[PDB]
Design a protein around this ligand. Structure first.
Ligand SMILES: [Zn+2]
Lengths: 276, 54, 277, 54
């Protein structure tokens, strides 16, 4: 049976890129942060970069601190660096164009952040856009057959394909509509030759008022189904803390359950803490 | 060979109608595997079709 | 202050096409059904058709009865017909796929009309979980004897979806930043198309008056305050969160009312417990 | 005329930076109207640009 957590990844020694997608209000932004936070506590001798193309600068909202276009360390830690940028601004109705040039610009712009700096980023985490991931560009050269571009794409595609180098973490909630989408996602991701072996399921009540001990039902219902249907994935099951959750402390505090599988019976007292 | 091709489409067509008649919402696991399989057959077919194209 | 309900629409006497969309788990399928049921009860001498291209047959799910490819009536009603179909079943340019898709549905809707003998007044489109194939009506512009054969048709549809009296789009959403953000993104798109949209439904509200509800509510209320000063000119109907799933004509009907006579927790709190069984 | 064009871009550029510096999540109403306005200016510009194209 596949361990129900993200320990394997949070302790990787091959992963240079970790995308993190999922459409919907899925607590994903808290998920990207937890992962980034956790890796950086488990490999201090490594430099992690967490970026967002989300143009509402969520990474900032989340940390409650104001990032920007130039990689900057999180106040509270010395290997984790948020970056919030926008490719469109910085940046032929073919399918793939926009996406390529865009992402492309991102990378160019990440390396700028590394050269002019001096110190450099080990493993970078992508917190996919609220308007979906730009990963369609992976299949550009195919529908292709100017080459200055198709040439760059390949160089990356090669590197996003290597399952030791790069994987995608899916985020979701225990709900028909969400899951449906999550599977649809996994299909596309594989359409690309992109490793994906992890699924984070957020917001579960574990309810042991009367809307809770009813909403729980469907959650538990579809949970059973996820179980039958992704045996070969680690799928970490995550608690729902009341109200918003943001702040390097809190963030750190809750990020643990991507490491050691949250168990309501026992890990319970830690959820009241974050609910105050 | 076309005799294998035909053999498949029955499967696809039959499995579609079956999945069509199930509560995808009350039998999520089942509905999906069936959909996956459904997609699987779509691709095995064209590999066939294209051979026959010669 | 435009009426915080859909009463204008549920009684319209001109609308032929009512689209209903919104991404996410936004209690939308219950919205499509409620509206459809509601018109049917306010225009009996009229025939309504609610169709879905959702390949997981959500209409059947919502009704707890099994619809299909051929227009058929909801058990318990005589002017409301549900239909579930799949266009994909029946030149990588932007617009094509979507256009033909829809096109084919139209054809197929007329089939259900002629072969029958009786015709549909007003159809309600429950847009797909992958979202509306509605991009197709900006095709003429960004756009070979069979070519015009299409563009001409498209113009004839567009001509009709463009008319504010004939067809509007209802947005479904919840009181949450991500959804709300996405909604406005949508409204822009819809307007980019010269498509009328002046209605927003906001589902899953707690109105709370345990201890996890009275906390999630604050956010809901929070963003409510924002919607209020950002869509003055929209009817935006605010709807209650019945505990648990909510299906079956009876229930669907009982709930559908709050799109007509705007909900109100202080008073109408009694009814919601009725569905919570 | 180009003197009106330039006048606009300052507006667009300046309004962008402002919106960039606000909590879109804690000031949703404001953030959006600003974005609408932002989009508005993008289109007024090209109408200009294209004139100048002659
Ligand atoms: Zn509760």
């Amino acid at each position: 049976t596949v361990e129900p957590n993200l320990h394997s990844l949070i302790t990787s020694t091959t992963h240079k890129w970790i995308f993190v997608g999922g459409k919907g209000g899925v607590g994903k932004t808290t998920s990207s942060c937890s992962i980034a936070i956790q890796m950086a506590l488990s490999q201090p001798n490594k430099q992690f970069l967490l970026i967002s193309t989300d143009p509402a600068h969520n990474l900032s909202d989340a940390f409650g601190e104001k990032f920007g276009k130039d990689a900057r360390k999180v106040t509270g830690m010395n290997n984790l660096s948020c970056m919030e940028i926008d490719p469109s601004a910085a940046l032929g109705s073919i399918p793939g164009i926009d996406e390529a040039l865009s992402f492309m610009e991102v990378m160019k712009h990440i390396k700028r952040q590394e050269q002019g700096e001096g110190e450099t980023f080990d493993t970078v985490i992508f917190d996919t856009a609220p308007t979906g991931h730009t990963l369609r560009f992976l299949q550009l050269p195919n529908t292709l057959s100017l080459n200055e571009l198709k040439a760059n794409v390949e160089t990356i595609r090669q590197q996003f394909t290597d399952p030791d180098l790069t994987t995608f973490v899916c985020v979701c909630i225990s709900e028909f509509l969400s899951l449906y989408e999550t599977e649809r996602l996994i299909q596309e991701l594989i359409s690309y030759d992109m490793d994906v072996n992890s699924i984070i399921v957020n917001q579960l009540l574990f309810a042991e008022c009367k809307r809770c001990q009813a909403r729980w039902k469907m959650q538990k219902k579809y949970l059973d189904q996820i179980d039958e249907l992704y045996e070969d994935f680690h799928v970490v099951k995550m608690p729902l803390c009341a109200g918003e959750i943001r702040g390097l402390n809190n963030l750190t505090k809750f990020s643990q359950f991507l490491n050691k599988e949250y168990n309501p019976i026992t890990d319970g007292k830690v959820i009241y803490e974050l609910e105050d | 060979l076309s005799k294998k091709y035909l053999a498949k489409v029955k499967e696809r067509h039959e499995l579609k109608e079956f999945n069509n008649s199930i509560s995808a919402q009350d039998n999520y696991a089942k509905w999906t595997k069936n959909n996956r399989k459904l997609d699987s057959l779509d691709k095995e077919i064209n590999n066939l079709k294209d051979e026959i194209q010669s």
